[PDB]
């Protein structure tokens, strides 16, 4: 999901990555994706950057390159909600 996201990030300003809000189907190519799904080339639209999505991209980048731990962003230990609880 990092390489997949890095190929959709739109470069802007002085080379900084911008997270597109959404990728939209070109009006002419709507019929093609009707028949063959998820293959037509989409154009970035909506908010640029998507300030919501951009933050988690940096947050994900921070915690994936060893600048932050899951516990520091989750000091209340919500990440352990999936561990089994004895009755």
């Amino acid at each position: 999901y990092k390489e997949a996201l890095e190929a959709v990030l739109i470069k802007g300003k002085n080379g900084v990555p911008l997270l597109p809000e959404l990728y939209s189907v070109p009006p002419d190519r709507v019929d093609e994706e009707y028949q063959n799904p998820h293959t037509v080339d989409r154009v970035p639209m909506g908010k640029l950057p998507h300030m919501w999505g951009q933050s988690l991209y940096i947050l994900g980048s921070l915690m994936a390159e060893g600048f932050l731990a899951p516990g520091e962003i989750d000091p209340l230990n919500r990440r352990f909600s999936t561990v089994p609880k004895p009755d």
Partner: protein
């Protein structure tokens, strides 16, 4: 250091009930005494027994540069110190010391009186510059009259000026005292870091001045309850105690003290000077109460009282409860830093199993209630108990570019009869089937005795069924610590020459209070 100073005072030493050397200590430039009463008392003794018209006597029965002292000899015979009473040389420099004391503490009457005492004993050079004599000695032909009536005979100056001999320490103290008295320098000028803090005594780190001041000590200690294992956590949970395993405070590393000493070993490293850093000595309650930041990782070390390596007393849960109580009382008494002290309480399964379950939970319920041993504590999560506290940043581990130093091992979560064999029964037995008697017997203390005899008779590192004698004996001691049969837990520690670090400081604590200690059994040789 502060306990030693408070215990020794108002005496300078065992031999000296009082000493003029205390005047620099409790006054300028050190102001080392913070307890006003101890200070008030300590001075009164110094003034009463050492003050004179010519100066202060260094200490009672002082033979330094006296008439009845042989200058060639560098030592005094035990029968000679009786000859120095009443004839002790009086040092005028302590007039200047008490003048500075008066200037600092704000009573000008003391300054004026002590200048008036100093003026007769001040000598002058050919240019009018005052000269402070080092000491005033009674003449050799006035010693008897001085002894009959102290202070009734004239004293001659050691230094007078016009001779080429000037007491530079005295001259410098004269300059400082005159500048302070003439108000050409403020006490705050020659004391930029406040060693003298007036009775408004609050918020000085390490100087007994906590937030509450010098009279109130209602310290609240940060107490984080840590369980060794997830089963321990869930089992303490079902009895109403909330605990966190080392993994549940995950970014934060819980450390033994040992690792903190290992981290501090790099403090002050200087290969060019041949300096090796901190000495390896256990960090104690005050040190482990701090929150440390090492290589970007925040670390908290549980107190030494939870280490199961130094001695086997902590294997007794009752002694563990009173050790926690004393540790919290000690931190309350002696923690005087800005932040609130953090006390990691480590719950072990061995501290729980069996009837030991009850007292440990009594202590934990007292902690949850907020008060134990009269010490207010704040039992909460370690993440909250670490947020806004002043962190100790061990930058020396990174200035040497040792960012890749081996990751220090943080604490890891875990995922019946009287002795049928008498000592004299088999020790007197000369023949050696006692080795088979080891298999014959079933008691663990029997195993401890047998493999101690094997470590003495059959070399230090002989092999056995389990392994080497040394590590088998260590395993036996560890096992005895667990199932609470304490004959073996004593025998293993004795036969392995086991010694805890707190003992030498404990003997020092006994000794500085005036209690000589002898370590030897009744009827044998005592040291």
């Amino acid at each position: 250091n502060r306990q030693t100073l408070c215990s020794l005072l108002p005496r300078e030493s065992r031999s000296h009930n009082t000493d003029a050397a205390l005047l620099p200590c409790i006054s300028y430039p050190a102001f080392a005494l913070d307890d006003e009463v101890l200070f008030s008392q300590t001075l009164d003794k110094v003034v009463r027994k050492l003050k004179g018209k010519y100066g202060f006597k260094r200490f009672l029965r002082d033979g330094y540069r006296t008439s009845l002292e042989d200058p060639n000899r560098c030592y005094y015979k035990p029968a000679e110190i009786k000859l120095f009473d009443g004839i002790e040389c009086e040092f005028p420099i302590f007039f200047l010391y008490m003048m500075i004391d008066g200037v600092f503490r704000g009573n000008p009457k003391q300054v004026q009186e002590y200048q008036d005492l100093l003026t007769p004993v001040l000598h002058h050079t050919t240019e009018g510059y005052p000269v402070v004599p080092k000491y005033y000695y009674v003449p050799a032909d006035f010693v008897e009259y001085e002894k009959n009536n102290p202070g009734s005979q004239k004293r001659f100056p050691s230094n007078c000026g016009r001779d080429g001999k000037l007491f530079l320490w005295g001259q410098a103290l004269y300059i400082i005292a005159k500048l302070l008295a003439d108000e050409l320098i403020s006490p705050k000028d020659i004391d930029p870091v406040q060693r003298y803090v007036p009775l408004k005594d609050q918020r000085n780190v390490s100087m007994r001045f906590s937030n509450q001041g010098p009279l109130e000590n209602d310290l609240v200690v940060h107490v984080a309850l840590i369980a060794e294992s997830q089963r321990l956590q869930v089992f303490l949970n079902t009895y109403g105690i909330q605990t966190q395993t080392p993994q549940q405070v995950e970014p934060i590393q819980i450390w033994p003290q040992q690792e903190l000493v290992k981290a501090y070993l790099q403090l002050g490293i200087n290969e060019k000077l041949g300096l090796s850093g901190r000495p390896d000595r256990p960090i104690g309650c005050l040190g482990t109460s701090k929150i440390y930041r090492i290589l970007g990782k925040t670390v908290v070390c549980y107190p030494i009282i939870f280490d199961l390596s130094d001695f086997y007393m902590s294997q007794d849960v009752f002694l563990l409860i009173d050790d926690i109580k004393n540790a919290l009382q000690f931190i309350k008494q002696y923690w005087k830093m800005h932040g609130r002290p953090l006390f990691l309480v480590l719950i072990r399964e061995d501290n729980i199993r069996g009837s030991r379950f009850n007292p440990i939970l009594d202590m934990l319920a007292a902690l949850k209630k907020g008060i134990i041993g009269g010490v207010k504590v704040h039992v909460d999560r370690l993440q909250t108990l670490i947020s806004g506290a002043v962190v100790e940043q061990l930058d020396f581990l990174r200035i040497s570019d040792t960012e890749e130093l081996p990751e220090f091992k943080s604490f890891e979560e875990l995922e019946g009869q009287q002795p049928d064999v008498n000592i004299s029964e088999w020790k007197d037995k000369p023949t050696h089937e006692i080795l088979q008697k080891l298999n014959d017997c079933s008691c663990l203390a029997s195993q401890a005795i047998l493999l101690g005899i094997l470590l003495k008779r059959e070399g230090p590192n002989f092999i056995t069924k389990e392994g080497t004698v040394s590590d088998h004996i260590e395993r036996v001691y560890r096992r005895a610590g667990s199932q609470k049969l304490w004959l073996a837990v004593r025998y293993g520690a004795a036969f392995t020459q086991k010694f805890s670090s707190s003992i030498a400081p404990h003997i020092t604590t006994f000794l500085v209070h005036g209690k000589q200690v002898t370590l030897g059994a009744f009827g044998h040789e005592e040291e």
